[PDB]
Design a protein around this ligand. Structure first.
Ligand code: HEM
Ligand SMILES: CC1=CC[C@H]2O[C@]1(C)O[C@H]([C@H](C)/C=C(C)/C=C/C(O)=C1/C(=O)C=NC1=O)[C@H]2C
Length: 399
């Protein structure tokens, strides 16, 4: 079992190309000090065809009950597993089809492509304020000033929350210590419980309140599932979109001609966003899946009960599927990326994220069109996360 080091967190693509050149399935381990999944042997899947097939393979399950066996090797206590604690992870993504359907139906109509379009005025409003609210300095740290607040402000609008989230999701996704993520985990179930009582005591009109009604009036939901669904909607949408803005901006700042070509022609913005998603996927990996029977990935047999990690970044930079996979081309044919997954678990917030990215980048080209990176591209570091691909900071100069 190959042990993955920090150098993998910094250039995972180089490791994937190495591994994919030899095969499609490789037994790996995350460093021992990764807070929850550290030291746990899994199969890393490299390769578009193999990753895209594996995502929708009926023999690979995301069930929390099945993945319990993986996490129990580190922490037997089901509620001490971070964002994989049962009080927070018992949602649609960690369920199989009979219950996945029910859970997704509670909220699918509110994340529809048509539904999300109605929010364009509010999102544009928030984007304009956020970039007007920050200082005028040589380094701005666009990640913390702009990239983090935008999705959480939008998500809070959809789930009824007025104006701590940034630090919490950072501890969950990229925690310094197991204690740091365990601390954030406890604080989240505490906060989510308080928020649910706030909805019961004073009913309102939003997704969260509608979810509370579905639990009490209609019994469509369980109490654990209700809390976990709130967590999934809250955290699930936040870390993803911030790194899209961050990862896309970095790559744009490294290829200024493509950045200006966007400023010149805005019709390329939708396709450019998908190219950011392909090149630097906010999630390098999908959730852990369990093999419910023996199956063969590539040329290697995966025994029943083993656990599998799908490298979405590896699939999105596979030369058999994408030409010049490591080069940013905003004019590249669009479609085919697996940044949102594939199969029944295809991201429900995909329409919302796409609109968020389009508005934020479009304003960023209108305002501060001459902004540039404040450091050398190579001194930028990436955070330590099993699934997330995001930067520690993104200093820029605007003028
Ligand atoms: C750049 C933005 C985003 C990316 C790259 C992304 C990525 C993904 C991926 C790859 C999956 C499937 C994981 C797997 O199959 O193992 C997924 C599922 C999911 N995502 Fe996202 N996501 C993004 C934004 C959002 C947002 C904004 C929300 C909500 C506000 C959201 C909520 C969800 C939910 C609920 C699921 C589970 C769907 C299901 O189980 O049917 N995501 N996401
Ligand atoms: C794969 C996922 C797809 C959809 C949602 O749900 C998963 C689990 O993720 C996402 C959030 C951002 C949460 C993450 C990445 C939680 C990470 C986590 O629990 C970690 C550790 O404990 C140590 N490294 C980690 O990355 C979120 C979009």
């Amino acid at each position: 079992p190959l042990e993955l080091d920090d150098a993998f967190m910094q250039d995972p693509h180089s490791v994937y190309a190495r591994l994919n050149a030899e095969g499609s399935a490789h037994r790996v381990m995350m460093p021992p000090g990764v807070p929850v999944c550290g030291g746990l042997p899994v199969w890393l899947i490299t390769g578009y065809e193999e990753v895209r097939s594996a995502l929708a393979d009926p023999r690979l399950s995301t069930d929390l009950n099945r993945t319990d066996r993986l996490f129990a090797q580190n922490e037997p206590d089901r509620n001490k597993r971070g964002a994989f604690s049962s009080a927070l992870a018992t949602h649609m993504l960690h369920s199989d089809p009979p219950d996945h359907t029910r859970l997704r139906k509670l909220v699918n109509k509110a994340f529809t492509s048509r539904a999300i379009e109605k929010l364009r005025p509010e999102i544009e409003q928030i984007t304009g304020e956020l970039l007007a609210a920050l200082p005028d300095e040589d380094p701005v740290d666009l990640l913390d000033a702009f990239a983090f607040p935008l999705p959480i402000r939008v998500i809070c609008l959809l789930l009824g929350v007025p104006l701590n989230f940034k630090s919490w999701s950072k501890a969950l996704v990229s925690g310094d210590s197991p204690a740091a993520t365990a601390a954030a985990s406890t604080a989240m179930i505490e906060y989510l419980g308080d928020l649910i009582e706030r909805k019961r005591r004073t009913p309102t009109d939003d997704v969260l309140a509608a979810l509370v009604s579905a639990r009490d009036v209609d019994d469509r939901l369980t109490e654990t599932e209700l809390v976990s669904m709130a967590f999934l909607l809250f955290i699930g949408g936040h870390e993803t979109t911030v790194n899209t803005l961050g990862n896309g901006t970095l790559h744009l700042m490294r290829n200024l001609d493509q950045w200006e070509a966007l400023r010149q022609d805005r019709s390329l913005l939708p396709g450019a966003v998908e190219e950011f998603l392909r090149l630097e996927s906010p999630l390098k990996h999908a959730t852990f899946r369990c093999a419910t029977e023996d199956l063969r990935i590539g040329d290697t047999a995966i025994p029943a009960g083993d656990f599998v990690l799908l490298a979405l970044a590896s699939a999105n930079r596979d030369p058999e599927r994408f030409g010049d996979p490591h080069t940013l081309d905003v004019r590249r044919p669009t479609g085919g990326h697996v940044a949102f997954g594939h199969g029944i678990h295809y991201c429900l917030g995909a329409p919302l994220a796409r609109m968020e990215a389009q508005v934020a980048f479009g304003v960023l080209l209108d305002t501060f069109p001459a902004m540039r990176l404040a450091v050398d591209p190579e001194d930028m570091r990436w955070r330590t996360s099993t699934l997330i691909r995001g930067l520690h900071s993104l200093p820029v100069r605007l003028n």
